[model samples]
Every structure is written in structure tokens, then in C-alpha cells.
Target: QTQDYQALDRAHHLHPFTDFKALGEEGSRVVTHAEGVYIHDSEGNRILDGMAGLWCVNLGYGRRELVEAATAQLEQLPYYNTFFKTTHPPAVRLAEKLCDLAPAHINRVFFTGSGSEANDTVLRMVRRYWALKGQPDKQWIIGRENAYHGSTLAGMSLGGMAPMHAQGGPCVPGIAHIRQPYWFGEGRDMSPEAFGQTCAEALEEKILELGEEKVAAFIAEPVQGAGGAIMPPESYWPAVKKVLAKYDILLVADEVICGFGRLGEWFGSQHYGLEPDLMPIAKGLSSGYLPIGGVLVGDRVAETLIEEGGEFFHGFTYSGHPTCAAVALKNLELLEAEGVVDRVRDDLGPYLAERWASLVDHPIVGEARSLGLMGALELVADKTTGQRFDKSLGAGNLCRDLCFANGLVMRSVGDTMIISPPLVIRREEIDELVELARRALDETARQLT
Candidate 1:
């Protein structure tokens, strides 16, 4: 059956961000089912889901509440679009619930099927808001290099991944990028406070170069997820916030990865004290039980757009789908009732951090950093100077493969091995994950030698 599935996958399934030809040759590792913190592959291997299914499944897998909510909605009223001046109960209720949960200023929301669409929505709404304010020249949006927004054209343009830009040809013009606040890679020599301020100042410099009048907004993730779990220093956001405030430029917090209790809070904006005008959110919304995302529009933008702008022309066909909304509502309920968010904030996060940081003693480890439930282990050739192994050595990839073989599912981004396990992952499971990762690191060092 595994061979049959692989054959079918090779014949069809074009995976995202994958080397197509190479995948067909290597065959596919098929994941068949999951429960709690573990996933079972087609080959009858049970592996710890370290990345929480691409950093979404926060509440873990196979929750009957989410399933029942979807089922109840489907049986009652399967599908309905909130368009053409028409709305339904599920959509209305979910919107209200989101507003209640979001920051005080963010009292409005526009739903999308995924985080990518939410960013796309932010683009149109931001530009349109400025145009309504009679500043049509303010169309340029600034992003940071290596930021991962999404794969959609507008989302890709707003993001700064060089590879995405290369294959896509010309990126969407008027979009600019500044240096990311990745002190570990870019400014490790400087004091953290100094490096953070330096990175934040890059935004102001870019804005000045583009002219404050022309720059529409600046977007960034609270914690760069796909960009190697790079947590900005404490001084970073404060400086960035001041810069944006001085210039009167809007702040768009891309919370696609850090939203919905990922950072041990209701939102990452809360954790970082970011007063963003627009927040793009997805993942953990319904615990990946259903695809859903939305933009939590601040009061200023929403009021301006509503009062001044006429006929805002944008939305997805599945915007505010009743079934998806129902699932999200139930997911939120379960999260609050179970106190999963608080548990991550207080107990599991600290416990996991202690266990995860122990890997720093490993010979090949350069540094290990964690915030809340997400963590990163930096691989190095020489621990004294943090010298990395050459890419040709395939050290990180080899370590990742070894993890898979040894019953863990850690992801490797370059020389950074990252993990974001489900919030419900038990203490013993954390121990299991760390033990496996330690073995994998040992093997990686051995293999590289």
C-alpha cells in the first residue's frame, strides 16, 4: 500500500516549494493519520510531530469537538458565502467572537480561507485606505528580507524570500525590503539591543529613501517562522514602532504563525506590545481542522475605509464560509475551556525550554533558543566561533533525515533545526522529542566528520 501510494504520488501530486523531479525519484513519505502529538506514516512508523503540522495544529490532532462542530454545521447549513449583502449565523457569530478576543482597537475582521489570502486582503485594504485618505502616492509597502508571508502573488511580493522572487521573475513593484532582525546570522557580534535597534532603523532608512509620503505601510512577523524562528531582540519592536509612528506609516503584523496562542498569548502583538493597524492571522485558528484566516482591522482603518471608501472590490468566494467559521468558533471555545493557552504560557513552555536548551551541550550545536513552544537549534562546525558546516555537506538535511528515521519530525532550515510541537504535547513526549533530537545531532556530527 505504501508503494502504491508512492507510485500515485509520483505520477501526480506536485508538492509546494519542492524539487519536482528529485521527489519522484526519491519517492514520498506518506503520513496516514495523527492523534495528539504523534503521526503514523504509511510505513507503520509512529513519529513525534515536532512542527505541529506546519505550525498549525496547536490543540493537537483528532479533536472530537472540532469534528462535531464541522459536522453540525454541515448537517444544518453546509455552505454559504457572506457576500452580496447576505450573511449567516455562523459567520456573524464568529466575527463577533474574534472581535471580542482580539485587541481592543481591532474590532473588525475579514475572513479568508488561509493566511496567504489574509495578507493579500491586507494589501488591498491598506492601499485603498490611503487612497481614500487622498494620498494615492502612498502605495509602497515595505517588508523584511527572508520574511515568509505566503505564496500568492501579492503575498509573495510583500514577502522578501529571494528564491521566491527569483523564480517568479519581476516581483510586484513598489514593494521594498529591509534587513531582518536576525542577529544570530547577520549581527551576532553586536550587543542584542544594539543589533535590534540597527535592524529596526533599516526600516526608517528605507522609508526615507522611498519618501514617507510614498510609503504606505511596513509589514513583519512577530517572530519569523519560516525564516528560521528568528526572534527579534527586545529593543527591536520598540524602535520599529517609534519609527513607524514618527512617519505615520501603518503597521501590518503578519501573525500567520504566531497568532492563536502560539506565543503563549492570545496574539503575538500582545506579547511584543505591537500596536499594528492590521493583523493577518491563520494557523491554530481551527487547529488546522479547517483552513481559515482573517485580517483584524484596527478601528482607524476600518472607520476610514467604511466612511470614505465606496465599494471596496475584493474578497474570496469562500470568505466567511459557515462550516469553517463554525469549526473556528468551536476551536476557540475548546482552547479557552481547556486553558491550553495559559498552560503553554506557564507550564509546558518553560519545561520544554529547559529540555530543549540542554541540546546546547551537544558538540555540534552553536546555540539553542526557544520562545514559548517554538525552538531552534543552530548547527555549527566549530562551537568556539559558531562556524557553520558547508552547505555541500548537507549537514542539516542529513540530521533531518536521521530524525525522521529515529521517530521524530524536526524540520531543517539551512543549518537551523526547528521544532514547534502541539500545545497538548505531554512532559514525557517532550523528553522523548529531546532524546531523539540529541541522538540525531550526535549522528549528524559523526556523519559530517
Candidate 2:
């Protein structure tokens, strides 16, 4: 089966953000099964899943409760569109639950099939809100450089990754970008607090240049995920909030990676003390057992749309896919009943932080940082000055290979090794992850020397 699967994939399946030629020559690693926090490859290797299956799968694998929820829902409703005034119990119930879990002002939801679609919906929602308020020209959306929104046209436009922008071609007009608060690469010499103020000031400067009346909203992630777990300084969010408040610009927190207890809170905005007008969510919403995402609408926007509204007219065929909604409901229920979020807040999160911090002592490691379950290790040639290895050396990629060989699943973003292991991982498993990472770093160091 593994051989057949590999042949079929190589012949037909095109992967995302990949080099097809290199992959075809090397073949693909086939993960045949998983249980708890470990995934089993076709080679019979039980590898630790350090990235939590693309930053989802928060509850880990082999969840019979989620499996049963899907089976039951399929037998009953199978599929139904949340259109034409027809609604299902699962959709209504999941929506109500989301409102309960969301911040006080957020009491409404518009579901999508994925985070990409949710962000696409965000463009429509924000533009329409301004139009209803009689300011149609207030349409520009500002995003941070290297911030990842999603893969759709509007999402790519809102995101600021240069490579993705190169492929983006003739981006949707009206989106501007400011510098991200990444102190390591961009502002290593400046104090983090000062750099945060500078980064936040860039937003105000951009707004003034564009004229505040022209900018409708500013979008960003609570913690930059795909851009490499880049955490902001303590002063960053507060400073940004002051600027946004002054301009009355709507804030969109792209919580696809930071929502659903990832940051030891219900959402990352909560962790950062931000009151976002629009919150895009996915990933852990259903623990990646199913694809489901939605925008949690705040009262300021929701009331304007509902009370003074007429046919906003935007939706997807699988907007509120009933089976996915049902599974998500169960997933939330499990998270609450089992105290998973609290464990991350009080116990496991601190434990992982201590362990992951130990990697900074390694020769190749310049810095290590983590928040809750998410973390990153910066690779540098000179630890004293935080000087990076030459780009041609492919230091991060090389270290990534060593990690795989050592039975770890850390991800490489340029020269940063990042991790977001399953929240359910035990203390012993955390120890195992650190040991494997240290061994991988040792090998990478030897290779470099």
C-alpha cells in the first residue's frame, strides 16, 4: 500500500510550496498511522510530531470522540448549505458556542471552509462595513511585512511575504504593508521595547501617508506563524493598539494559528490584550479533524451589518458544513471538560518553555523563544553577535534534515527552527523532544564545521 501510494502521489499529486523535481527524485515520506503525539511512517519509524500537523491537530491524533461525531453527523445530515434561509442544528449550535467562547463584544460568526476563505470573507465584510457607513473610499487594508494571511488572492494581497508577492502578480489594489516586529533579523541592535515602538510607529506613518480616511482596517496575526513563530515584544501590541485607536481603524486578528487555546487563552488577541474588530479562525477549531474556519464578528461591525443592512451577498458552498461543525462542537467540548487550556496556561506551557530554552546553549543556536506551545530557535554562526550562517549553506534546511533523521518533526523557516507540538504532549515527551533537538543541533554543528 505504501509503495502504491508513493507511485500514485509522484505521478499525480502536486504538493504545496514544494520543489516537485527534488521531491520526485527523493520520493515522499508516507505517514501511514498516528496515535496520541506520535506519527508512524511507512518505514515503521514512530516520529514525534513537533509541528502538530501544520499547526493544527491540537488534541493530537486517534481521537475517537471526533471520529464518532463525524460518523453520526454523516449518517444524519451528510451535507447542507447554509444558504437560502435554511439552517441546521449543528451550524446554529456551533455558532452559539463560538460566541460563548469569544470575547464579550464578539457574538456573531460567518463560517468558511478554511482560513483562506475566512480571510477572503474578511475583505468583503470590512469593505461592506465601510460602505454601509458611507465611506466606500476607506478601503485600504494594512498588513505587516512577512505576515501570512492565507493563500487566496485577497489573502495573498493582504499578506506581505515577498516571495508569495512575486507569484501574487498584479495584487488586489488598496493593501499596504508595514515592517513586522521581528527584532532578531531586522532590529537586532535596538532594544526589543524600542524596536516594538518603531514597528508600531510604522503603521501610524503608513496611515498618515495614505491619509487615515483611506485606510479601512489593519490585519495581522497575534503571533506570526508561517513566517516563523515570530513573537512580538511586550510593548508591540499596546503601542499598535494606541495607534489604531487614534485612527479608529478596524483591527483584524488573523488567529488561524493562535486561536482555540494555542496561546493558553481562547484567542491570541486575548493573550495580547487586543480588542479586534474581526477575528479569523481555523486550525484547532476542529483540531484539524475537519476543515472549518470562520470570522468572529464584533458588535461594532455586526450591528451595523444586521440592523442597517440589505443582502451583503457573500458565502461558500461549504460555509457551515454540518459534519465539520458537529466535530468542532465536540472538539470544543473536550477542550473545556478536560481543562486542556488551563494545563497549557499553568503547567505544560511553562514546562516546555524551560526545556526549549535549554537549546539556546547549543553551538548553532543563537536564541530560543517560546510562548505557550509555540516556539522558535534561531541558528547563527556567531552567538556573540547573533551573526547568521551564510544563506548558501542552507543552515536551517540542513538542521531540519538532521532533525528528521533524529526522529523529530521541527520545521525550518529560513534559519529558524520552529515547533508547535500537540498541547496534550506529556512532560516525558517534552524531554524527548528537547533531547532529539539537542542531538540534531550537535550534528548540524559538526556538519557546518
Candidate 3:
């Protein structure tokens, strides 16, 4: 049966971010179902889901409340568009809930079907805002190198992944990229504080080079997610805030991967105390129970767009679909009622940090770092020199496969193995995750050495 399913998938289903020929040759693993923090494959392996189903699924799997919410909404009013000035109760309530959870200055929401669509909306909204402010020339949006926005043309252009760009054809213009504050990978030569200052100043330099008036906004994640969960240094955000303030540039904090309790806060912007003009959110907004995303519009942007920018002509067909909105609304209510965010802040985050940091002592580990439930382990060729392995070796890929074989689902971004486990994972589960990770690392070391 498993072989049959794999054959069917390989024959017909084209996977995202995957090498089709390689997968077709190797065959695919058929995941049967999941419960709590573990996923069961057709082979009868119960694997710990360390990456939380693409860094979403904050509430873990098999949530009856989420299922019930979706069923109720589908039975009632399954389909409706937020366009044409018609509003639904689910959309209205969800908007209010989101605004209440967001930063005080962010009071408006523009819904979309997914994070990529939300980011596409962001591009249009940012340009529209500048037009409303009578500064249409302020068109450039600066992002970081290797950042992951999404996969759409506009989202891809706004992001700075080189490999994606190599095949992305001509990208959307006026989107620039600066160096990220990846202190471990890029700034080991200097003290972290100095490197952070340098990276933040790069934004200032870019603004000056572009002419401050021409740069409309700077977009970034509080913690770079698909860029290997790279957490910026302590000095990074404060200095970046100052630069944006001086240049009067809008700040767009992309919260697709880091929002909704992933950072032990309601939003990553709140975690870093950022007053962003817009926040593109998805993923955990509905705990991966439904596809829903939105741009939380700060008052500065919302007021201008609402008052001056008449009928901004951009929307998705499924914008604010009632079913998705209902699920999202119930997801938020469950998160709040269960004190899930506070538990992450006060309990699980610290517990995970303590355990995850211990991985740095492994012979192959160059660094082990975490923020909230998100963690990364850098695999190196030499511990003392912190030299990386040859790219041809595919150490990260090997380690990721080893993790899967050992009943863990850690993802590999090159040689950096990263994890973003379910927020509902327990203390003993964290211990298990670490143990499994260490075992995978050991096997990786054995084969490489």
C-alpha cells in the first residue's frame, strides 16, 4: 500500500521545493496521520515533528476544536468574498481579535489566502501608501540576503534567496537586498555587537545611497526562519529602528513564520518591540488548520490608505473566505483560553533553550542557538577552527535523513539543521527531541569523519 501511494505521488504530484527526479528514484514516505507532537508514517514510525509542519502547527495535530470550527463554518456559510463591501461575521470578528492581539498602533487587517499572497498584498499596499502620501518615487523596499518571504513572483522578488532568483526569471523591480545580521555564519571575525552595528548600518548606507526619500520601506523577520532560524544580535533591532526613524522609511516585519506564539509572543514585532508599518502574518494564525493570512496595517499606513487611497485595486479571489476566517478565529480563541503564549514565554521557551544549548558541546557542532521553540545546530568540519564541511559532502542533507531515520523531523538548510517544534510539546518531549538530535549528529559525524 505504501509503495502504491508513493508510486501514485511520484507519478502525478509535483512537490514544492523538491527535486522531482531524485524523489522519483528514491520513492516518497507516505505519512499516514498524526497525533499530539508525533506523525506516523505508513511504515509504522512515530516521528517527532521537530519542524512543526513547515514551522506552523503551533497547537500541534488532532485539535478537535479546530476541526469543529471548520466544520461549522463549512456547514453554515462556506464561501463568500470580502470584496464588493460585503462583510461576514467570521471575518469581522477575526479582524477585531487580530487587532486586539497586535501592537496598539496596528488596528487594521487585509486578509489573503496564504502568506505569499499576504506579502504580494504588502508590495501593493506599500506602494499605495507612498502614493497616498504624495511620494510615489519612494518605491524601493529593502530586504535581507537569503530571507524567505514566499514563492509568488512578488514575494520571491522581495526576498533574497539567490538559488530561487537564478530560476525566477526577471524579478519585480525596485526591491533591494542588504546583508543579514547572521553573526554566526557571516560575522565570526568581529564581536557580535560590532557585527550587528555593521549590519544595521548597512541599511542606513543603503538608504543614503538610494536617497532616503526614495526608499519606501525595509522588510525583515525578527528571527529569519527559512534563512536557518538566524536570530539577529542584541544590538541589531535597536540600531535598525533608529535608521528607519532617521530616514522616515516604513518598516514591514514579515511575521509569516514567527508570529502567533512561535516567538513566545503574540507577534514577532511585539517580541522585538518593533513598531512596523505592516506585518505579513500566516501559518500559526490558524495553527495550520486552514489557509489564512493577512497584513496587519499600522495606523500610519492604514489611515493614509483608508482616507486618501481610494479603492486600492488588489485582492485575492478567496480573500477573507468565511471558513478560513472561522477556523482562524477559533484558533486564536483556543490559544488565548489555554494560555498557550504565556506558557511558551514563561516555561517551554526557557526549558528548550537550556536543553538545545547543550548540543553545542557535540564534536561536530559549531554552534547551537534558539529563540523560543525555534532552534538551529551548525554542523562543522572542525570544532576548534569552526570550519564548515565541503558543500559537496551534503552534511546537512545527510543529517536531516538521519534524523528522519531516527524518528525526528529536523530540517536542514545547507549544513545548518533547524527545528521549530509544536508549541504544545512537553518537557519530556523536548528531552526526547534533543536526544534524537544528538543521535543524528553522532551518525553524521561517523559517516563524515
**Candidate 1, residue 433: lDDT:** 96
How high is the CA lDDT of each candidate model?
0.91, 0.93, 0.93
lDDT of 2 by residue, 114-208 (tens): 99999999999999999999999999999999999999988899999899889947888899999999999898779999999999999999999
Q: Point out where model 2 deviates above 4 Å.
A: none
**lDDT, candidate 3, 58-147, per-residue tens:** 999999999999999999999988787798999999999999999879999999988999999999999999988999999999999999
Candidate 3 structure, TM-score to reference:
0.99
> Which RMSD values do the candidates have, in order?
0.9, 0.9, 0.8
Tens digit of lDDT per residue, candidate 1, span 291-402?
8999999999999999998778889999999999999999888888999989989999899899998999999999898888989999999999998999999888999999
TM-score per candidate, in order? 0.99, 0.99, 0.99
Query: Could you tell me which residue pairs clash in candidate 1?
Result: none
lDDT of 2 at 145: 95
Candidate 3 segments whose C-alpha is farther than 4 A from its true place: none
Worst 10 residues of 3 by lDDT: 240-249
Residue 192 shift from truth in candidate 3, angstroms: 0.7
